[PDB]
Structures are given as structure tokens and as C-alpha cells.
Design a protein around this ligand. Structure first.
Ligand SMILES: [Ca+2]
Length: 354
């Protein structure tokens, strides 16, 4: 099982007749580059008019594809193919920074403050466990995301591809940063079975430690936000059971087993990860911005007050890949695997309309 990005947007009922025109989506990259030949062939094969793609160098880094499809080129082309396939009217600005937290910070503030490209959306699918970040870098990052919220820019981040432990074996549960930020729309991952625009079934992405699984959990750094106050977020499963910001907010297809068809450095292939969901929803927000005639910005508070039928609730599975305790599990409403669920594009747009 494999989908084009178009088949996925169809299952999530993205609003038709909108392609992101007049909008600029920013995409953060910390390594590799994209092969233009790949994009050219991919977009055409999908029937999509070649989108404008430009690179911006940050802290001396630049677009540098190595040709190795199994390298960071794959991260980069996945970001672009998936989003560019779904908002091809939008201008894509890809910011390349050194693979450091200072570079990542700098690429994000470069994007937000861009006086020329002024992106209205920032797509992020890089990060790490919050404990791997220093308190100072965490604080700089969060000022940035707040700034973003003040400028009407939406910021979206993949919640992780390693389950509730996010890759650590220090025997604790952890969420990823920057999705853990309250000012970031955290994107979880599901397993999607769909066709002709109707989802047949959608469960938690979890293919074990070998296969990867959706990030999700309870932030140990940030306290439960006011707008999450009655979303049924639990305390972390970690002893002490501190309450904290629940991750994620929304979720989309991320299971490589029901994966995305893309072309990485010439080779046809199928990928997944929550890495595909931020750019997928980045394109949804850009289409919605076009319709609105202005950037929607920071959506987290809005999302949590929308009626339930704006989402496809995910209620089965868990995102534990380290033990059999099923920490965390899906269920009715918000859960620490899939958050509010998958959005139903046309209904989110209708709620956002005057
Ligand atoms: Ca749910």
C-alpha cells in the first residue's frame, strides 16, 4: 500500500480549487539538499504544475544534494515533494542551516522574519527529545515560535518517528522538541487505509522499534496549556506523573507500510514518518490561507474548541515501541498518539470562514 500525496489529501478532504497561490511556505532543512531533476519528474508525473522552489542559505549552509537517496537528500525531497504536490501554487522557500540547534534556531528566525519571502507557514520535520535540548536553546526556540504566532505565521512540526520514548533507552517516556512547544502545531502519525476520498480505517502508526512509530506524550518542559484544559490530557506516564503539554495536536498518515510514493534522487520509492505530516498539513494551511485572503496563523487554541466532527477521531492503537505497557494509547477524543485526530480539510476551512 502506497499513496500519492494527492490520494492522501483526498482522504483528508483538502478544499478543492485552492493551490496556495499568493502564499509562501517555508521549509527548514539541516542537511543535504534537493535534486531538481527529481522534483521535476515527480511533480510532472502527478500532473502538478511545477511549483516555484527557492533555497535560502543560513549560517553558511546551502542546498547541496549528495546524490545518495538513502542520505539527508531523502529528508529534504520528502518535505518538498509532499508539500509542493499539494500547494503547488505556493512559493517554497527552503532554508538550509548547519546541523546544529543554533542553525535550526537561526533557520526558523530567518524564515519568520523574512522581509522578502514572508512565508505564512513554516514546515518542520527535524527535532530531538526535549531533554537533549539545553534550557537556553529551548527558550530561544520558544521566543521564535511566539514571534511566529505574533506575525500570523503557522508553525508545524513532526512529533517524531520513535514512539513514546522518542528514541531514548534511559527507561523513560519522552516527547520531541520542537513539537512539544505550545506554539507549534505538533503532527502525529497514523496508519491510513483509504480510497476515493473516504477513509476506511485510520489507526495509530506503530510498526515496532524496527519500523518506527508516532511520537506523542506529555511534555515535561511545558505545563498543560490553558486551551488544552479540558482535552483529557493525562499526566506523563513517568513517575511523579507531572501534568504537561500533550503531544500531538493533529495526526496524518505516517506508516511507511501505507506510505508515500515519492522520487528521491531519481529513484522511485515509498516513505513515511511523521516527517510527511507537517508538510502535508502545511499545504492544507496554505490552501486555507488563500481562501481566506490572509494568513490564519497560530491554530492550536482554535483547534481545541472546534466541534468534534471537524476531525476524524483515531481511537485504536498505541505508540509504545519500548515495552508492552501500551504507553500511550489511542481513544475517543484527544489522545497522546494522534491528538485531536486527522483534520477534515473542508470542514476546518468552513469553521475558519467568516
Ligand atoms: Ca482519539
Amino acid at each position: 500500500t502506497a499513496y500519492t500525496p494527492l490520494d492522501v489529501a483526498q482522504a483528508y478532504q483538502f478544499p478543492e480549487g485552492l493551490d496556495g497561490q499568493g502564499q509562501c511556505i517555508a521549509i527548514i532543512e539541516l542537511g543535504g539538499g534537493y535534486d531538481e531533476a527529481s522534483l521535476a519528474q515527480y511533480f510532472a508525473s502527478l500532473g502538478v504544475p511545477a511549483p516555484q522552489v527557492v533555497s535560502v542559505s543560513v549560517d553558511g549552509a546551502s542546498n547541496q544534494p549528495t546524490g545518495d537517496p538513502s542520505g539527508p537528500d531523502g529528508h529534504v525531497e520528502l518535505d518538498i515533494e509532499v508539500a509542493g504536490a499539494l500547494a503547488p501554487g505556493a512559493k517554497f522557500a527552503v532554508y538550509f542551516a548547519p546541523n546544529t540547534d543554533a542553525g535550526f534556531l537561526d533557520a526558523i528566525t530567518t524564515a519568520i522574519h523574512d522581509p522578502t519571502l514572508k512565508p505564512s507557514v513554516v514546515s518542520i520535520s527535524w527535532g530531538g527529545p526535549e531533554d537533549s535540548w539545553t534550557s537556553a536553546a529551548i527558550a530561544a526556540m520558544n521566543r521564535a515560535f511566539l514571534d511566529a504566532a505574533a506575525l500570523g505565521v503557522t508553525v508545524l512540526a513532526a512529533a517524531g518517528n520513535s514512539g513514546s520514548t522518542d528514541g531514548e533507552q534511559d527507561g523513560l517516556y519522552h516527547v520531541d522538541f520542537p513539537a512539544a512547544s505550545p506554539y507549534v502545531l505538533a503532527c502525529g502519525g497514523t496508519r491510513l487505509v483509504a480510497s476515493g476520498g473516504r477513509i476506511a480505517q485510520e489507526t495509530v502508526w506503530n510498526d515496532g522499534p524496527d519500523g518506527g512509530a508516532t511520537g506523542g506524550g506529555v511534555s515535561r518542559i511545558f505545563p498543560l496549556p490553558a486551551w488544552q484544559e479540558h482535552a483529557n490530557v493525562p499526566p506523563s506516564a513517568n513517575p511523579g506523573a507531572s501534568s504537561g503539554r500533550g503531544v500531538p495536536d493533529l495526526a496524518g498518515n505516517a506508516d511507511p507500510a501505507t506510505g508515500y510514493e515519492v522520487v528521491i534522487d531519481g529513484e522511485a520509492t515509498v516513505i513515511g514518518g511523521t516527517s510527511a505530516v507537517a508538510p502535508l498539513f502545511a499545504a492544507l494551511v496554505a490552501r486555507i490561507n488563500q481562501k481566506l485572503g490572509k494568513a490564519v496563523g497560530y491554530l492550536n487554541p482554535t483547534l481545541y474548541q472546534l466541534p468534534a466532527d471537524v476531525f476524524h477521531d483515531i481511537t485504536e492503537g498505541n505508540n509504545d515501541i519500548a515495552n508492552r505497557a501500551q504507553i500511550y494509547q489511542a481513544g475517543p477524543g484527544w489522545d497522546p498518539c494522534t491528538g485531536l485526530g486527522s483534520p477534515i480539510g473542508v470542514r476546518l476551512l468552513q469553521a475558519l470562514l467568516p
